[PDB]
């Protein structure tokens, strides 16, 4: 009777947030791996420039261990800050790893540890020399930068270093947008992002890394979750307004605009196209279940918190509930109207196992062949009967 | 049901202001670069005239470092004030740079540091001499001013110095309007502004800088963000009324009238044309999402603060959300109606990848062929059917 | 009549806090002197030990400029902290000076500037070498430490560095107690404090500086006010409880226990002895003005704030109002009763020009020959006449 | 007038808690030293017994570094717990040190690190072998235990290990009572404490360490504050009732009864004897100041918190304010009645510089020659006039 179809509505609402309450224990604590991070101790551009040159080689090195590669990645990302050690320690929320910050101090060809020389320090120098030699020999004499003069370049002015660093930072931060969603299909939007900043003159194109190095970094960025967690944490903190933003921060925040809501196009297309833009083909006894599920997802997205846009980047388990497959019918209808309306929408890969072409066809007919679709009019257009016809004539 | 399409609206409203709350930390602190600014210590007209000539030469110089160019620009912008050091120190909000104000004191051909002569001073003296020599040799003997007599001109009267400084400041401040939006397509609106100010006799046309120097300064202004931030801060402070305004301040505010809302013609054109000028073609079930996004953008713009008009100049990350691309349909409709209505609108470059020519055609038709479009009439026009027919006859 | 003698009291109360209200302007801004501070960039024990040895040499140097000596003192005082630059920048309230923090980086025999070598660095290196040579040649080959082996000592263990640094900091901090009150009459209380800390095993006696270096450092500390202000700020910050205190902080607070209320023995002795310890000779119609002045001074001391005990160290102008001379009669009475009562009091130098020997004699008599002086008894001692007689018998 | 002597009472009360408010900053952060702690990973008695044998030798070793000695001390104290690593990490509040817990795993003659053998592990084995060889050679073949059979004893039963460990724990925990107050004058109460537990059969006397080893441990315990802080933290946590107490915990809590209020006998004797046991010789114009100061100290002691009894052990700077010297007169009177009443009181060393024998003599007369001292009688003893005489006759 009347109680039925309302008990279920509460039942489905209760089922979604079934056991996601309370606080977990410390027994389920992941084993931690030591990660050695080489941060610049001083503000001298000559040491900082030599440091970021070293961090570039470690990432490009094929003989480098993964833990060393994460250290180079953490060294690069925090290079812009005046106190990289403080930034890493105050913006790290990775239970998987423990970070041991190492102040570099001075600069040899590699890094001088300068701590009880001879005692457990000599082998580290030999290891780093092997890292540098293998990195340079691995490539065909090709420097990480697209310009061979940008590698063996002497930097002493603070102004040049800041411009040089930001270009390295910006090019790395470009990859996060499509590092885990479709890393192979990248280099098109990434080039478009780089071209945009070049025209804005925010980045000096002289310090442009080659695509060989970018592929190596992107492979590192996809494999490792700790680096992704650190960069997502930076994005959220930078997103919070209130303080003055520097040139490095403004670029990061601008890049974070493209990063948000990545990897969840199937869910958001359903919200924007299938659900909104109210079409008379919604209530058809095959979307009422999906509409109920979608309503629960909106509450779940609001309940998650500030990490909701970057769910795919952090690989949250909540993401699977958001993916199409739990509401294949409405999503199929949503992609039907999406391809017809949005020209860009159509390069999306939607060859899933629950396409349901009949509902896809209905969405295609909904955009054009269904009706003009005049919604509630606050302004009273009594003579708009022909106005719809002219609009419908197209 | 009824809850749907309102839950979704609240969801989009919450998603717009998702994580832009709270206060950030000091860990994300940009590295600062020292910027040396040469300000006049006294009010003697000859010293100030020599100082602004030196600043012009340094800006024109090709061998000048970028920091020196920024120092020269800051010296120029604050020349009108009787206390340039106080003006710079009390109107600087640039975390990227730290300004070390230097009182010039006396004046040689260059500038006498007058601080422990021989100790760390002769090198700076020879550097400034090299700067001046390279600046003079670089051009084909052409002075920065369009009149060769305006360069080697002796100034001893305060009024003449004030007039020349006002002209130089005005000619500098014309460039900010189209320095980052379309610097290449400039020199038309800039020439129009210069002609307008000449016809108003606010600027003496004798001190007119050549177009080569103007191009060099526009390139410098586009490259650097600190100068843009300082000039935007000056514009914001001058805009606040309450006190007496001098000739320099009046000219600066008149220029800032044109400066405001630059680089956001898409959003404001969308508002003014698509949103206002209520057309029966608005409520069409394909514009509701765009209207909701536009409303959220309106609240965001109100929330941003006094820096909202100058977001493109400061390169705020919030600007990307304002750009068309999140509402291409309504934007295309508004561009169509604007191009049909506003004759000047049509020189705008709108060859984007989301043009949607169908909606552009729909807007073009809605502008003219749609109907007369009589809105709510407070005055009762009983017999205005024939008036509407005659108006539609055109 | 009745109103008079109360109008006078209100008049004196208003006169005490006559013009000490409102906020001052920025026009009265002292000229600032640049002070170069060499702080350790890293946590390596060898670098910190070499840095503190260099600071000791610079302080002992006779050819050192005063600014260099202040920089060395600031380097020494902040050596215990893991981030000396942050400690100095966040605990500096000196309008007289501006501090330019310099991260040392690596360390040669002196300090490597490591910033554009050859450009304005070689002269500083030669100056530092001259400073070291003059410091070493000035004494008769006598190292700053009382043990010649403590100077040319290699430090690589963190614990040894911490112990040596704590000892040096403690020996420095002993001097502040009697640096400006009576620097010449020192070396007795200072030696007592050093012996106390040695017997407590808080300080390793191996790193004990010679008395020549201690005299030089005490002279430097008395001459300079910025160092005193910095150390008083450190004392005030450490005094505020709430957080865990390290060995250095505990030693500093224990020394500040002796530091407090220094140089104001006259006022506090007057309070404790003349005002408290109620004697029948107090209300005698020659002490009412002094009592009113003392009450006003107590109100002023409560009004001053947390800087009240260290008024002599900061050389506050309000201190002169606290000194005896505005209440010579009650002060003399209190010093008489103190010299008769307190055995230790009597080594104080009170050969002032307002001794008033009659009141000193009156206080001496009031201490012993006056009466037993039984005050208000909560317990009813009805048979205490014989007890009072026996007590007066002595 | 009446306001005077009440303004001072508030003034002295306000002066005590002058600047002890608010929260300190993190700038004053002590440099941390790494401390390596060898904890047993498993519960096997054979490994635990071999571990505590190793920790005994390290403490006895003369060639051992201080940091190693602290690690042995931390290893011993936490040996009773089933999870020594959890106990140390959850009961450590030492900002001076950082503890790196090392699970021992298996057991060779020394300790097998078992982590990448050959890589930075071989030298550690050689160092430990040097530690063991020097420790055994330093003594004249004397084992740490008073019984030579207790050293080379095989332990496989859990029951024997628990009894053996507790004896080692109890003997170490005896020293804390008089480790910093008067370490030289120890071995009398310490032997008395040990004899008491032997008669109670809580400790098996077979595992009794020689006095040569106890002196070495006590010297370590006095020098190092980190060990004292850890053991004080254990005392407070064990003091908090609510849970079941094991044999190890019960001994520690029983020992903590003697540890409490150590090193503050001068203050507490004044409270118990001078202030309490109300004598008609209190109000004499020479104790009113001391009574006021004593009252302020009681509030300060209550304000400190649970760490108030162990102020001397933690070497809190607040302790100096509690020491006699700020109230020498009443303390001298208090010790006067203390020596006459308490036979044990009189072995205390009170040869200070502020003895004031006249007030000491008055205290001596106060106990016996002053009066019987009949206080307020709730029971009405009308015929007690002769009862006092018989009591006074003695």
Short mmCIF file of C-alpha atoms in Angstrom, two decimals, chain C:
data_model
loop_
_atom_site.label_atom_id
_atom_site.label_comp_id
_atom_site.label_asym_id
_atom_site.label_seq_id
_atom_site.Cartn_x
_atom_site.Cartn_y
_atom_site.Cartn_z
CA UNK C 1 37.75 69.88 56.33
CA UNK C 2 36.72 66.26 55.73
CA UNK C 3 36.92 66.52 51.94
CA UNK C 4 40.55 67.64 52.03
CA UNK C 5 43.20 64.92 52.60
CA UNK C 6 41.02 62.85 50.22
CA UNK C 7 41.08 65.30 47.33
CA UNK C 8 44.85 65.23 47.83
CA UNK C 9 44.91 61.43 47.66
CA UNK C 10 42.86 61.42 44.46
CA UNK C 11 45.12 64.17 43.10
CA UNK C 12 48.25 62.10 43.72
CA UNK C 13 46.60 59.00 42.24
CA UNK C 14 45.64 60.94 39.10
CA UNK C 15 49.08 62.57 38.93
CA UNK C 16 50.85 59.20 38.98
CA UNK C 17 49.05 58.03 35.82
CA UNK C 18 48.92 61.55 34.41
CA UNK C 19 49.69 61.22 30.70
CA UNK C 20 50.31 57.49 30.34
CA UNK C 21 47.27 56.93 28.13
CA UNK C 22 46.52 56.63 24.44
CA UNK C 23 48.66 55.39 21.58
CA UNK C 24 51.81 56.99 20.21
CA UNK C 25 52.53 57.77 16.56
CA UNK C 26 55.02 56.27 14.11
CA UNK C 27 56.80 59.61 13.66
CA UNK C 28 59.04 58.87 16.67
CA UNK C 29 60.72 55.92 14.95
CA UNK C 30 64.33 55.18 15.87
CA UNK C 31 66.93 54.77 13.14
CA UNK C 32 67.69 51.09 12.61
CA UNK C 33 71.07 49.36 12.31
CA UNK C 34 71.62 46.23 10.25
CA UNK C 35 72.75 43.25 12.35
CA UNK C 36 74.14 40.16 10.59
CA UNK C 37 73.40 36.90 12.42
CA UNK C 38 75.10 33.62 11.46
CA UNK C 39 72.72 30.75 12.25
CA UNK C 40 73.38 27.06 11.48
CA UNK C 41 71.34 25.89 8.50
CA UNK C 42 71.51 22.16 9.32
CA UNK C 43 71.53 19.97 12.43
CA UNK C 44 74.95 18.38 11.91
CA UNK C 45 76.84 18.49 15.24
CA UNK C 46 80.20 19.31 13.65
CA UNK C 47 78.86 22.41 11.91
CA UNK C 48 77.14 23.68 15.05
CA UNK C 49 80.25 23.08 17.17
CA UNK C 50 82.44 24.92 14.67
CA UNK C 51 79.87 27.73 14.54
CA UNK C 52 79.81 28.19 18.30
CA UNK C 53 83.62 28.09 18.39
CA UNK C 54 83.64 30.83 15.74
CA UNK C 55 81.11 32.86 17.73
CA UNK C 56 83.24 32.52 20.86
CA UNK C 57 86.28 33.72 18.91
CA UNK C 58 84.39 36.68 17.44
CA UNK C 59 83.06 37.72 20.86
CA UNK C 60 86.56 37.42 22.34
CA UNK C 61 88.03 39.31 19.37
CA UNK C 62 89.19 42.87 20.15
CA UNK C 63 89.08 44.01 16.52
CA UNK C 64 85.43 42.97 16.10
CA UNK C 65 82.88 45.67 15.37
CA UNK C 66 79.99 45.99 17.81
CA UNK C 67 77.45 44.79 15.24
CA UNK C 68 79.52 41.65 14.63
CA UNK C 69 79.67 41.06 18.39
CA UNK C 70 75.88 41.36 18.65
CA UNK C 71 75.51 38.94 15.75
CA UNK C 72 77.82 36.46 17.46
CA UNK C 73 75.88 36.84 20.72
CA UNK C 74 72.59 36.17 18.92
CA UNK C 75 74.19 33.17 17.21
CA UNK C 76 75.29 31.81 20.59
CA UNK C 77 72.01 32.38 22.43
CA UNK C 78 69.90 30.65 19.76
CA UNK C 79 72.33 27.76 19.19
CA UNK C 80 70.34 25.34 21.36
CA UNK C 81 67.21 25.60 19.21
CA UNK C 82 66.86 23.27 16.23
CA UNK C 83 65.66 26.23 14.12
CA UNK C 84 67.68 29.24 15.33
CA UNK C 85 66.40 31.48 12.54
CA UNK C 86 62.76 30.89 13.45
CA UNK C 87 63.52 31.41 17.14
CA UNK C 88 65.27 34.73 16.47
CA UNK C 89 62.61 35.97 14.04
CA UNK C 90 59.68 34.98 16.29
CA UNK C 91 61.19 36.34 19.53
CA UNK C 92 62.57 39.73 18.45
CA UNK C 93 60.97 43.00 19.58
CA UNK C 94 63.84 45.45 19.05
CA UNK C 95 62.92 48.68 17.21
CA UNK C 96 66.57 49.78 17.42
CA UNK C 97 67.89 46.97 15.20
CA UNK C 98 66.92 44.93 12.17
CA UNK C 99 68.15 41.33 12.00
CA UNK C 100 69.18 39.79 8.68
CA UNK C 101 69.29 36.05 9.33
CA UNK C 102 72.05 34.25 7.42
CA UNK C 103 71.95 30.48 7.00
CA UNK C 104 75.53 29.25 7.24
CA UNK C 105 75.16 26.21 4.99
CA UNK C 106 78.57 24.56 5.00
CA UNK C 107 81.60 25.61 7.06
CA UNK C 108 85.22 26.37 6.26
CA UNK C 109 87.66 27.54 8.95
CA UNK C 110 85.53 30.69 9.04
CA UNK C 111 82.21 30.75 7.19
CA UNK C 112 81.69 30.28 3.43
CA UNK C 113 79.33 32.94 2.10
CA UNK C 114 78.54 30.63 -0.85
CA UNK C 115 76.72 33.32 -2.85
CA UNK C 116 78.28 34.55 -6.11
CA UNK C 117 81.87 33.77 -5.15
CA UNK C 118 84.17 36.65 -6.08
CA UNK C 119 81.27 39.13 -5.97
CA UNK C 120 81.28 41.00 -2.64
CA UNK C 121 82.27 37.87 -0.69
CA UNK C 122 86.07 37.80 -0.70
CA UNK C 123 86.24 40.99 1.37
CA UNK C 124 83.94 39.46 3.99
CA UNK C 125 86.08 36.31 4.02
CA UNK C 126 89.24 38.36 4.59
CA UNK C 127 87.46 40.30 7.33
CA UNK C 128 86.44 37.08 9.09
CA UNK C 129 89.98 35.70 8.80
CA UNK C 130 91.31 38.95 10.30
CA UNK C 131 88.76 38.66 13.11
CA UNK C 132 89.84 35.09 13.88
CA UNK C 133 93.54 35.95 13.74
CA UNK C 134 93.14 38.98 16.02
CA UNK C 135 91.03 36.95 18.45
CA UNK C 136 93.61 34.17 18.64
CA UNK C 137 96.59 36.54 18.91
CA UNK C 138 95.00 38.92 21.44
CA UNK C 139 95.14 36.52 24.37
CA UNK C 140 98.38 34.82 25.39
CA UNK C 141 97.39 31.72 23.45
CA UNK C 142 94.60 31.18 25.99
CA UNK C 143 91.52 29.48 24.59
CA UNK C 144 88.09 30.73 25.71
CA UNK C 145 87.59 27.53 27.71
CA UNK C 146 89.43 26.98 30.98
CA UNK C 147 90.62 23.68 29.47
CA UNK C 148 92.86 23.99 26.41
CA UNK C 149 91.62 20.61 25.16
CA UNK C 150 88.03 21.91 25.00
CA UNK C 151 88.92 24.34 22.19
CA UNK C 152 90.59 22.05 19.66
CA UNK C 153 88.03 19.32 20.36
CA UNK C 154 86.36 17.37 17.55
CA UNK C 155 82.61 16.89 18.03
CA UNK C 156 80.62 14.36 15.99
CA UNK C 157 78.15 12.89 18.52
CA UNK C 158 74.91 14.80 18.99
CA UNK C 159 74.91 14.27 22.76
CA UNK C 160 78.36 15.82 23.23
CA UNK C 161 77.37 18.83 21.12
CA UNK C 162 74.18 19.26 23.13
CA UNK C 163 76.06 19.07 26.44
CA UNK C 164 78.73 21.56 25.36
CA UNK C 165 76.13 23.96 23.94
CA UNK C 166 74.06 23.77 27.12
CA UNK C 167 77.14 24.51 29.23
CA UNK C 168 78.06 27.52 27.09
CA UNK C 169 74.49 28.84 27.17
CA UNK C 170 74.29 28.43 30.95
CA UNK C 171 77.61 30.19 31.52
CA UNK C 172 76.44 33.03 29.28
CA UNK C 173 73.06 33.27 31.02
CA UNK C 174 74.61 33.57 34.49
CA UNK C 175 75.92 37.02 33.56
CA UNK C 176 72.53 38.65 32.84
CA UNK C 177 71.54 38.62 36.53
CA UNK C 178 74.30 41.07 37.53
CA UNK C 179 75.31 42.58 34.19
CA UNK C 180 73.81 46.08 34.53
CA UNK C 181 73.19 46.38 38.29
CA UNK C 182 76.78 45.84 39.48
CA UNK C 183 78.93 44.22 36.78
CA UNK C 184 82.16 44.97 38.66
CA UNK C 185 81.01 43.28 41.90
CA UNK C 186 80.19 40.08 39.98
CA UNK C 187 82.10 36.75 39.83
CA UNK C 188 80.84 35.79 43.33
CA UNK C 189 77.14 35.15 42.67
CA UNK C 190 78.05 33.97 39.17
CA UNK C 191 80.55 31.47 40.58
CA UNK C 192 77.94 30.35 43.11
CA UNK C 193 75.41 29.73 40.32
CA UNK C 194 78.00 27.83 38.29
CA UNK C 195 78.90 25.68 41.30
CA UNK C 196 75.21 25.00 41.95
CA UNK C 197 74.62 23.89 38.37
CA UNK C 198 77.78 21.75 38.41
CA UNK C 199 76.67 20.01 41.61
CA UNK C 200 73.29 19.35 39.98
CA UNK C 201 75.13 17.72 37.04
CA UNK C 202 73.06 19.81 34.63
CA UNK C 203 76.23 21.25 33.06
CA UNK C 204 79.36 19.35 32.09
CA UNK C 205 82.24 21.21 33.82
CA UNK C 206 84.63 20.31 30.98
CA UNK C 207 83.29 23.16 28.80
CA UNK C 208 84.02 25.97 31.26
CA UNK C 209 84.98 29.32 29.77
CA UNK C 210 87.79 31.31 31.36
CA UNK C 211 87.07 34.42 33.39
CA UNK C 212 88.68 36.70 30.79
CA UNK C 213 86.14 35.64 28.17
CA UNK C 214 83.36 35.95 30.75
CA UNK C 215 84.46 39.50 31.56
CA UNK C 216 84.56 40.41 27.87
CA UNK C 217 81.09 38.95 27.30
CA UNK C 218 79.70 40.71 30.38
CA UNK C 219 81.10 44.01 29.10
CA UNK C 220 79.49 43.38 25.71
CA UNK C 221 76.17 42.47 27.34
CA UNK C 222 76.20 45.59 29.53
CA UNK C 223 77.09 47.87 26.60
CA UNK C 224 74.34 46.55 24.31
CA UNK C 225 70.59 46.76 24.86
CA UNK C 226 69.43 44.62 21.92
CA UNK C 227 71.00 41.45 23.36
CA UNK C 228 69.43 42.20 26.74
CA UNK C 229 66.03 42.71 25.11
CA UNK C 230 66.33 39.43 23.19
CA UNK C 231 67.29 37.49 26.32
CA UNK C 232 64.50 39.11 28.34
CA UNK C 233 62.03 38.14 25.61
CA UNK C 234 63.36 34.58 25.74
CA UNK C 235 62.94 34.60 29.53
CA UNK C 236 59.36 35.87 29.29
CA UNK C 237 58.43 33.30 26.63
CA UNK C 238 60.01 30.44 28.60
CA UNK C 239 58.29 31.59 31.81
CA UNK C 240 54.90 31.00 30.15
CA UNK C 241 54.13 27.38 30.98
CA UNK C 242 52.00 24.90 29.10
CA UNK C 243 54.46 23.05 26.87
CA UNK C 244 57.24 20.56 27.54
CA UNK C 245 60.52 22.18 28.56
CA UNK C 246 63.89 20.95 27.35
CA UNK C 247 67.14 20.96 29.28
CA UNK C 248 68.17 24.32 27.80
CA UNK C 249 64.75 25.82 28.51
CA UNK C 250 64.74 24.46 32.07
CA UNK C 251 68.20 25.92 32.73
CA UNK C 252 67.14 29.25 31.22
CA UNK C 253 64.03 29.41 33.41
CA UNK C 254 66.00 28.41 36.52
CA UNK C 255 68.43 31.25 35.82
CA UNK C 256 65.55 33.64 35.14
CA UNK C 257 64.29 32.79 38.61
CA UNK C 258 67.35 34.68 39.86
CA UNK C 259 67.12 37.25 37.05
CA UNK C 260 63.66 38.51 38.02
CA UNK C 261 63.25 41.75 39.98
CA UNK C 262 66.94 42.58 39.61
CA UNK C 263 68.17 46.12 40.18
CA UNK C 264 65.11 47.05 42.27
CA UNK C 265 66.14 45.78 45.70
CA UNK C 266 65.32 49.14 47.28
CA UNK C 267 61.65 49.13 46.30
CA UNK C 268 60.95 45.46 47.05
CA UNK C 269 62.93 45.61 50.30
CA UNK C 270 60.89 48.67 51.29
CA UNK C 271 57.68 46.76 50.52
CA UNK C 272 58.59 43.54 52.31
CA UNK C 273 60.16 45.06 55.42
CA UNK C 274 58.73 48.54 55.97
CA UNK C 275 55.25 47.99 54.56
CA UNK C 276 54.64 44.39 55.58
CA UNK C 277 55.75 43.26 59.05
CA UNK C 278 53.37 45.77 60.59
CA UNK C 279 55.25 47.75 63.26
CA UNK C 280 53.64 50.22 65.70
CA UNK C 281 56.13 52.78 64.36
CA UNK C 282 54.59 52.78 60.87
CA UNK C 283 51.70 55.21 61.41
CA UNK C 284 53.76 58.16 62.62
CA UNK C 285 52.56 61.08 60.40
CA UNK C 286 55.90 61.15 58.56
CA UNK C 287 55.23 57.96 56.57
CA UNK C 288 51.74 58.61 55.16
CA UNK C 289 53.04 60.28 51.99
CA UNK C 290 55.48 57.41 51.47
CA UNK C 291 52.69 54.88 52.00
CA UNK C 292 50.51 56.63 49.42
CA UNK C 293 53.42 56.73 46.96
CA UNK C 294 54.07 53.03 47.62
CA UNK C 295 50.42 52.18 46.92
CA UNK C 296 50.57 54.16 43.68
CA UNK C 297 53.79 52.37 42.75
CA UNK C 298 52.16 48.99 43.39
CA UNK C 299 49.28 49.98 41.12
CA UNK C 300 51.76 51.11 38.45
CA UNK C 301 53.72 47.85 38.75
CA UNK C 302 50.52 45.86 38.29
CA UNK C 303 49.65 48.07 35.31
CA UNK C 304 53.03 47.68 33.56
CA UNK C 305 52.53 44.05 32.60
CA UNK C 306 54.74 40.98 32.19
CA UNK C 307 57.79 43.21 31.58
CA UNK C 308 57.59 44.68 35.09
CA UNK C 309 60.24 42.48 36.83
CA UNK C 310 62.80 43.09 34.07
CA UNK C 311 62.52 46.89 34.09
CA UNK C 312 66.21 47.52 34.83
CA UNK C 313 67.32 45.09 32.12
CA UNK C 314 65.20 46.86 29.49
CA UNK C 315 66.10 50.23 31.08
CA UNK C 316 62.50 51.41 31.25
CA UNK C 317 61.90 55.06 32.07
CA UNK C 318 59.17 53.98 34.50
CA UNK C 319 61.90 52.42 36.66
CA UNK C 320 63.16 55.80 37.91
CA UNK C 321 59.79 56.44 39.56
CA UNK C 322 60.24 53.14 41.43
CA UNK C 323 63.70 53.96 42.79
CA UNK C 324 64.07 55.25 46.36
CA UNK C 325 64.29 59.02 46.41
CA UNK C 326 60.59 59.64 46.07
CA UNK C 327 60.02 57.94 49.44
CA UNK C 328 63.34 58.27 51.30
CA UNK C 329 61.84 58.13 54.81
CA UNK C 330 59.98 54.82 54.61
CA UNK C 331 62.82 53.44 52.48
CA UNK C 332 65.35 54.27 55.20
CA UNK C 333 63.09 52.76 57.87
CA UNK C 334 62.71 49.57 55.83
CA UNK C 335 66.44 49.27 55.17
CA UNK C 336 67.10 49.70 58.89
CA UNK C 337 64.68 46.95 59.85
CA UNK C 338 66.05 44.78 57.03
CA UNK C 339 69.68 45.18 58.10
CA UNK C 340 68.64 44.32 61.64
CA UNK C 341 66.48 41.35 60.58
CA UNK C 342 68.01 39.91 57.40
CA UNK C 343 71.65 38.89 57.87
CA UNK C 344 72.28 38.75 54.12
CA UNK C 345 70.87 42.26 53.70
CA UNK C 346 73.64 44.58 54.80
CA UNK C 347 75.97 43.80 51.94
CA UNK C 348 73.70 46.06 49.90
CA UNK C 349 75.17 49.46 49.03
CA UNK C 350 72.83 52.12 50.41
CA UNK C 351 75.19 55.10 50.74
CA UNK C 352 72.69 57.42 49.06
CA UNK C 353 72.20 61.14 49.61
CA UNK C 354 68.82 60.74 51.36
CA UNK C 355 69.69 58.26 54.09
CA UNK C 356 68.04 60.21 56.94
CA UNK C 357 69.92 58.47 59.78
CA UNK C 358 67.22 59.34 62.32
CA UNK C 359 64.68 57.11 60.57
CA UNK C 360 67.32 54.41 60.07
CA UNK C 361 67.90 54.43 63.83
CA UNK C 362 64.15 54.39 64.41
CA UNK C 363 63.85 51.29 62.23
CA UNK C 364 66.78 49.62 63.96
CA UNK C 365 65.07 50.20 67.31
CA UNK C 366 61.68 49.11 65.97
CA UNK C 367 63.17 45.79 64.88
CA UNK C 368 64.37 44.73 68.35
CA UNK C 369 63.70 47.17 71.22
CA UNK C 370 60.18 48.14 70.13
CA UNK C 371 57.91 45.38 71.50
CA UNK C 372 56.93 41.77 70.98
CA UNK C 373 54.29 42.93 68.50
CA UNK C 374 51.44 40.42 68.61
CA UNK C 375 49.12 40.88 65.63
CA UNK C 376 45.52 39.76 65.12
CA UNK C 377 45.21 36.21 66.49
CA UNK C 378 42.60 33.93 64.94
CA UNK C 379 43.38 31.49 67.76
CA UNK C 380 42.58 32.99 71.16
CA UNK C 381 45.83 33.01 73.16
CA UNK C 382 44.37 34.21 76.45
CA UNK C 383 47.40 33.19 78.52
CA UNK C 384 49.99 34.47 76.04
CA UNK C 385 51.22 37.39 78.16
CA UNK C 386 53.97 35.20 79.61
CA UNK C 387 54.65 33.78 76.14
CA UNK C 388 55.14 37.31 74.79
CA UNK C 389 57.37 38.16 77.76
CA UNK C 390 59.52 35.08 77.11
CA UNK C 391 59.71 35.88 73.39
CA UNK C 392 60.81 39.45 74.15
CA UNK C 393 63.37 38.11 76.64
CA UNK C 394 65.23 36.37 73.78
#
